[model samples]
Target: QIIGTVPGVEVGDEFQYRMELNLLGIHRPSQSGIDYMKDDGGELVATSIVSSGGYNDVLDNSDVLIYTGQGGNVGEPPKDQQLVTGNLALKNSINKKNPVRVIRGIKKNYVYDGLYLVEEYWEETGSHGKLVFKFKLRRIPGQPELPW
Candidate 1:
């Protein structure tokens, strides 16, 4: 069930990660930035942290990470019940039942891969905008067998 051959380095799309994703095994695509494309018909997708490319001039705060909606684009903050919600609701969304995908990095390609529970998510206003989602994802206790 793995998806790619490269581990993400930069944050956002450059990392090639997923939101409420499930990277079970080694995937096919080897390219980076390619999203996991939710298992739900390979349509819904997500990323760990989003940049300020979405909202208006809402300046970005280096301290916090924002959650962009499924659109994977600016101004597309995710809402509704289809994808993970923000605030307390996300607590249930990031449960072990729904492990987020994490591609390896630093060591490079396939070094680390597996799911991590979303430790927390909250609503915050970007330096330039409002109603932004931030996340605090925690890798599972033990390292998942790297599929390198």
Candidate 2:
């Protein structure tokens, strides 16, 4: 399975939604990183400044896809090939076993954050696609209930 963070979003875990787009600069075209994504209501969430590549939905099944930097808005540079520019940083963080936080679903009061640990990562192309970095994350086990 995908082996994710809290609630453990498995590899085959169906994606729901991720509303952490942008507070602004989303609709500004000609930018980089995730632009927009289909929301729970089936409407485009925000006009983004990056190219998300539908990673929050069906693209979520790809097992790997991310933009660069925090917002992934800086966009990729010339002659660059990959979905994200911050892959190096992301890798560095996960490589260090640091906790990676992200919005993992579409639900009530879920402005919520989920944390994951990088299990493994690699860089490669999809047959003929540009070289892309892939990451496999695993959930950090929580303290068991005291069984009150």
Candidate 3:
């Protein structure tokens, strides 16, 4: 779980966040072809990097994939590969710490904007992935009515 504190935010606010995954190096079809190869040795080709806002529904459950690469018309640079980037908007509120029945409530609008880097790896090719991104917005922080 990721935790962060936003200053000057009380309750009831909305914010936008941009989560990006960047990829470096060259991805050749021949050399990198196996990179996208499926478990049964099928080629894993990428159509584009920029998703149409929301959860990804293309990737399979166990398919190992990278966020960014040198192909597709998602962004500039890093050609012949695929990169993943998306945006999410969420409200700031207090989240209950528990295994079941988590509650969130809006106390005041909170705005937060910053970039964070996260490292991940692909299980299939064992390739490393990085997430360098920033998000901005406001949210409300407070306790929600708990169910008793």
Candidate 4:
């Protein structure tokens, strides 16, 4: 999430802030299969990729996407078996102008079968008092036999 704090500006003043994130070459699991009963030699079937339509909407209206594991389930899968993607935006209303301070934070879980790869933050400041921030994130591919 991107955040900014202005400490002393009076009411009616106008300022603008912008943020963007770009992901490159993200590698995710292409398929998943299940095998049961070693003695009986059960067959393994591939699970199709359920969420792959691509996003096409304004940045402010983007939706959060999620993925979950299937097969061999009694109810819901454990927390370590889920995947999620989303963004959070933060804006501050205070009183200062010069050197506007911004604080950013993020929290996510790294599952044993999946990995989250993120890049450095890029910020651009404008003479008219606008700030722009950008970043990138990718998910590394997972091996079926390895825990990650």
Q: Model 2, range 1-148, lDDT digits (tens) per residue? A: 0112334332223232233222221122233332333334533322222223323222243333343233321224323344333444455545356555443333322222234455666654434444545556543456221110
Using lDDT as the measure, the top candidate is: 1
Top TM-score hit: 2
Report the candidate with higher TM-score, 1 versus 2.
Answer: 2
User: Whole-model lDDT, candidate 2?
Assistant: 0.35
Ranking of all candidate structures by their lDDT, best first: 1, 2, 3, 4
Itemize residue pairs with steric clashes in candidate 4. Answer: 6-95, 6-96, 7-95, 7-96, 8-95, 8-96, 9-95, 9-96
- Superposed Cα RMSD, model 4: 23.6
Q: What TM-score does candidate 2 get on C-alpha atoms?
A: 0.41
Please provide, for model 4 over 53-116, each residue's C-alpha lDDT reduced to its tens digit, 9 standing for 90 to 100: 2211111211221222232221243222111111111011101111111111112211122221
Candidate 1 residue spans exceeding 4 A from truth: 1-92, 104-113, 144-148
Per residue, candidate 3 scores C-alpha lDDT tens digits across 57-136 of: 12221222223222232234322222332211110111111111111211322121121121232212212232322211
User: How much does candidate 3 score in TM-score?
Assistant: 0.19
Question: How close to the true structure is residue 90 of candidate 3, measured as C-alpha lDDT?
Answer: 12
Looking at model 3, residue 2 earns an lDDT score of 18
